[PDB]
């Protein structure tokens, strides 16, 4: 029948912060949807509890865009790390279908308790 996400898209390491240039360097699990008209990453995942800004340099390098995110999404994961209590952020304005695909791939290939 109607399926959520036949073949999802994947991961990147990116920079974030709480606003403005609180942007540090690298710090976030940026789950990407790459379409060849520019990479529109979908999800942020983090072990920094409250991020409000993220930032990715444009492909030309002279520009660099900031991305504002929702409240966190609490959860806990299984791995050799033991449990991992981590926090998830949807770029505000993310429509329900993109949240759907992201959470789908998450609860599919991510250990969680």
């Amino acid at each position: 029948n109607n399926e959520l996400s036949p073949v999802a898209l994947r991961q990147m390491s990116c920079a974030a912060g709480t606003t403005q240039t609180a942007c540090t360097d690298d710090n976030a699990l940026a789950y990407y949807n790459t379409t060849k008209g520019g990479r529109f990453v979908l999800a942020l995942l983090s072990d920094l509890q409250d991020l409000k800004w993220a930032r990715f340099p444009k492909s030309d390098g002279t520009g660099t865009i900031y991305t504002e995110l929702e409240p966190p999404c609490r959860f806990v994961t299984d791995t050799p790390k033991g449990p991992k209590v981590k926090y998830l952020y949807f770029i505000k304005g993310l429509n329900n279908l993109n949240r759907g695909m992201v959470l789908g791939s998450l609860a599919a290939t991510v250990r969680l308790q």
């Binding site: 029948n1 109607n2 399926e3 959520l4 036949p6 073949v7 999404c73 609490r74 959860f75 429509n95 329900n96 279908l97 949240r99 759907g100 959470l103 789908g104 998450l106 609860a107 599919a108 969680l112």
Partner: protein, 805 residues
């Protein structure tokens, strides 16, 4: 054996009768909305994986409540059971029962959904959006099962028609609250998931016509409180049905109760902005796109279409006396006028003029104009009128007695007739005979014609499909160029034509094009980018030869509207009429080999070419307002540099206030026009072409999406269908590459020749035979659900030999 039934009906009233044959499944032909990497679409498939037992009442009579037991893999068993156990407490979830029965040496598991119904909502939506009066069995069944009519109603053949037998609406409206109940339960279900932390996509064919939900085989789990339902294909496929059945009619009742008096709103209230938001939040809670009740706050033309779609529906609740110009008492030369300082559109909400001023010393020529054109001073100073001849909301009677206008007979040219019979014409049994005359009309012929606007009903449109069709239709208009022009660049052939009301008291259009200098005309034009000027429209009978005695009538639009619409549109309108080889063939002459060139162009290279032509019944009076607004928004897509965003909205608002829902002056009285095109405005012959292309494109979309994807052999067209479904219901912003690709496909296999609602199509016969482009049944269905007219196949022609065009 038979213990299977005693097990299916478990603990609750074992009044079951098998429908299958023991323990084998029961196959049916039902409409599914399915998408999963091997097929997308909204089409009738064959369901094979369900045993089905119907409950009987007492009396041993059969009742409409079935037990549907599904057989599947042993895991989907536990998956669905986990999700159900999380979701069981919702009142909008059909009761399940998971058990295991052994057929042979094999404990096979079954999922018994209980007390469900024969058809699901997808069957209703499909039956109404793919109407075919020869094959409408399931629609008749749905109608008689829920006491909307009784089978002897279908012996009244022509029952399905909207123009003949307009009582059919009263029948469809009986499904209304049933549908409405479904909507309510959907919201409950959504809330349920969002609390249980379930992520899934809701489809219309997993919810029966009571409202309950089932089928959790494709849901997954997340942390509670953070689930998310995906309701795009559900709400948007369902949208055309909400106004057909008038689902929300139980909202004008004192407490949303159909057994209670009507709400009596304050007469002076016009805002209704909080009510629209409460309606949106009550019925479309999880529709994740901003809804601006007042379309002034919209961001682009696609947001305008989106939010005006919802306004179309929510405005059927509010009292009809609260729409139209919003007047106000201003003081000019120490004397109080009543003038219009805004408007309340059913589609665009409340719009306020930006440059309104109260104490003015004296009026200019331009202000004298825009005050003599407003219906405000005219209606405020006339007698009340209750005209019981029509159903259109009458407004006022600007006189003391009604005017009854007749039509004279034509004059006979006896000399030519005698000469013709001298040359041996008009002999009995000849083929060429007289059929075109001047038919005379009696007094009440004007209004009895205006009354045809009763064929214009509030139509909601499938928004996620209209938003794609608008991209394709706009692609059909890339070859041209447009923009604003100064007052000294407009061209007016024949200045001696009437200037509308009341200007026709003092002179023809020449007087008003002479008395205002180019700077006055430009000030007037730039005034309508910050203000709404409602105008009046006369209705005139025509005196012309014809073949049918139905009276004809055209809309004389006031000079204040044409004078500005010309400057807004004429550059593009004259760049359309000056292009050869395009799809729109306005301007192309038929002489000197124009006809041959047009036909050889439309027969571009289509491989198995057939020709096809259709017909729009009552095209001008049945055209929904959403399609008129879309046509004007497509014509205004060329102003991306000359006009700003608020300017474009205020010009659209002026267009609606002047030639869509204007005040028609028929007889000697002001009535309200519900919708549809005014046939005498500045852009009729081109708005009609845009509407024509829109309907043809959506017929193609419906014909390709409603095809069993597994049966298509050309593995390029399958992928095109899959991508088309994604681009409609999964994507949210335009996908320009696929828009180009669909437009190329259409131009390859479905070439058109379009004049203002007249059309020829050269199409690939062996594709239309397989349902990969629009046939004529597709046009029939599309007009049925998107235009509220039934197009009989006696007015549509087809031709299989191209050497006779």
């Amino acid at each position: 054996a038979q213990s299977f039934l005693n097990r299916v009906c478990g603990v609750s009233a074992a009044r079951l009768t098998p429908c299958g044959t023991g323990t084998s499944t029961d196959v049916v032909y039902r409409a599914f909305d399915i998408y999963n990497d091997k097929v997308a679409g909204f089409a009738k498939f064959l369901k094979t994986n369900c045993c089905r037992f119907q409950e009987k009442d007492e009396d041993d009579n059969l009742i409409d409540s079935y037990f549907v037991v599904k057989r599947h893999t042993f895991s989907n068993y536990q998956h669905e059971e986990t999700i159900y156990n999380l979701l069981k407490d919702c009142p909008a979830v059909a009761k399940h029962d998971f058990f295991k029965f052994r057929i042979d040496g094999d404990m096979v598991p079954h999922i018994s959904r209980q007390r469900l119904t024969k058809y699901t909502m997808a069957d209703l939506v499909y039956a109404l959006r793919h109407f075919d009066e020869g094959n409408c069995d399931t629609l008749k069944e749905i109608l008689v099962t829920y006491n909307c009519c009784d089978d002897d109603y279908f012996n009244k053949k022509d029952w399905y028609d909207f123009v003949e037998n307009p009582d059919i609406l009263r029948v469809y409206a009986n499904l209304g609250e049933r549908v409405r109940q479904a909507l309510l339960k959907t919201v409950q279900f959504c809330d349920a998931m969002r609390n249980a932390g379930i992520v899934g996509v809701l489809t219309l064919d997993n919810q029966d016509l009571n409202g309950n939900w089932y089928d959790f085989g494709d849901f997954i789990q997340t942390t509670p409180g953070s689930g998310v339902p995906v309701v795009d294909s559900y709400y948007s496929l369902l949208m055309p049905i909400l106004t057909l059945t008038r689902a929300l009619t139980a909202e004008s009742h004192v407490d949303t109760d159909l057994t209670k008096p009507y709400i009596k709103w304050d007469l002076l209230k016009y805002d209704f902005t909080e009510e629209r938001l409460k309606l949106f939040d009550r019925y479309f809670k999880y529709w994740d796109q901003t809804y601006h009740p007042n379309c002034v706050n919209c961001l682009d033309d696609r947001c305008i279409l989106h939010c005006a779609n919802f306004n179309v529906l929510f405005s059927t609740v509010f009292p009809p006396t609260s729409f139209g110009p919003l007047v106000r008492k201003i003081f000019v030369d120490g004397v109080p006028f009543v003038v219009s300082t805004g408007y309340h559109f059913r589609e665009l909400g409340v719009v306020h003029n930006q440059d309104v001023n109260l104490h003015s010393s004296r009026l200019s020529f331009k202000e004298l104009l825009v005050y003599a054109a407003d219906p405000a001073m005219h209606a405020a100073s006339g007698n009340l009128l209750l005209d019981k001849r029509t159903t259109c909301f009458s407004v006022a009677a600007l006189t003391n007695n009604v005017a009854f206008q007749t039509v004279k007979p034509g004059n006979f040219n006896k000399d030519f007739y005698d000469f013709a019979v001298s040359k041996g014409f008009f002999k009995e049994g000849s083929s060429v005979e007289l059929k075109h005359f001047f038919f005379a009309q009696d007094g009440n012929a004007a209004i009895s014609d205006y009354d045809y606007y009763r064929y214009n009903l509030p139509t909601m449109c499938d928004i996620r499909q209209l938003l794609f069709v608008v991209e394709v239709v706009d692609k059909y208009f890339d070859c041209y160029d447009g923009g604003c022009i100064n007052a000294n660049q407009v061209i007016v052939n024949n200045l001696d034509k009437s200037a509308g009301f009341p200007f026709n008291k003092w002179g023809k259009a020449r007087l008003y094009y002479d008395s205002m200098s180019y700077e006055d005309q430009d000030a007037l034009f730039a005034y309508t980018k910050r203000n709404v000027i409602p105008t009046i429209t006369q209705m005139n009978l025509k005196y012309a030869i014809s073949a049918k005695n139905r009276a004809r009538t055209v809309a004389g639009v006031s000079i204040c509207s044409t004078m500005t619409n010309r400057q807004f549109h004429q550059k593009l309108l004259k760049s359309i009429a000056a292009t050869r080889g395009a799809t729109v063939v306005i301007g192309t002459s038929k002489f000197y080999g124009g006809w041959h060139n047009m036909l050889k162009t439309v027969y571009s290279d289509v491989e198995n070419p057939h020709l096809m032509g259709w017909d729009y019944p009552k095209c001008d009076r049945a055209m929904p307002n959403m399609l008129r607004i879309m046509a004007s928004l497509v014509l205004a897509r060329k102003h991306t540099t000359c006009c700003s965003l608020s300017h474009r909205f205020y010009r659209l608002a002026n267009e609606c206030a002047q030639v869509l829902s204007e005040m028609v002056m028929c007889g000697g009285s002001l009535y309200v026009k519900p919708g549809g095109t005014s046939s005498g405005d500045a852009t009729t012959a081109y708005a009609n072409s845009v509407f024509n292309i829109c309907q043809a494109v959506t017929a193609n979309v419906n014909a390709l999406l409603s095809t069993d994807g597994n049966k298509i052999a050309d593995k390029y067209v399958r992928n095109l269908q899959h991508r088309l479904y994604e681009c409609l219901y999964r994507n949210r912003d335009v996908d320009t590459d696929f828009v180009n690709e669909f437009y190329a496909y259409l131009r390859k296999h479905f070439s058109m020749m379009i004049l203002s609602d007249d059309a020829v199509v050269c199409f690939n016969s062996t594709y239309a035979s397989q349902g990969l482009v629009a046939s004529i049944k597709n046009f029939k269905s599309v007009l049925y659900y998107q235009n509220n007219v039934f197009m009989s196949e006696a007015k549509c022609w087809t031709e299989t030999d191209l050497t006779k065009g």
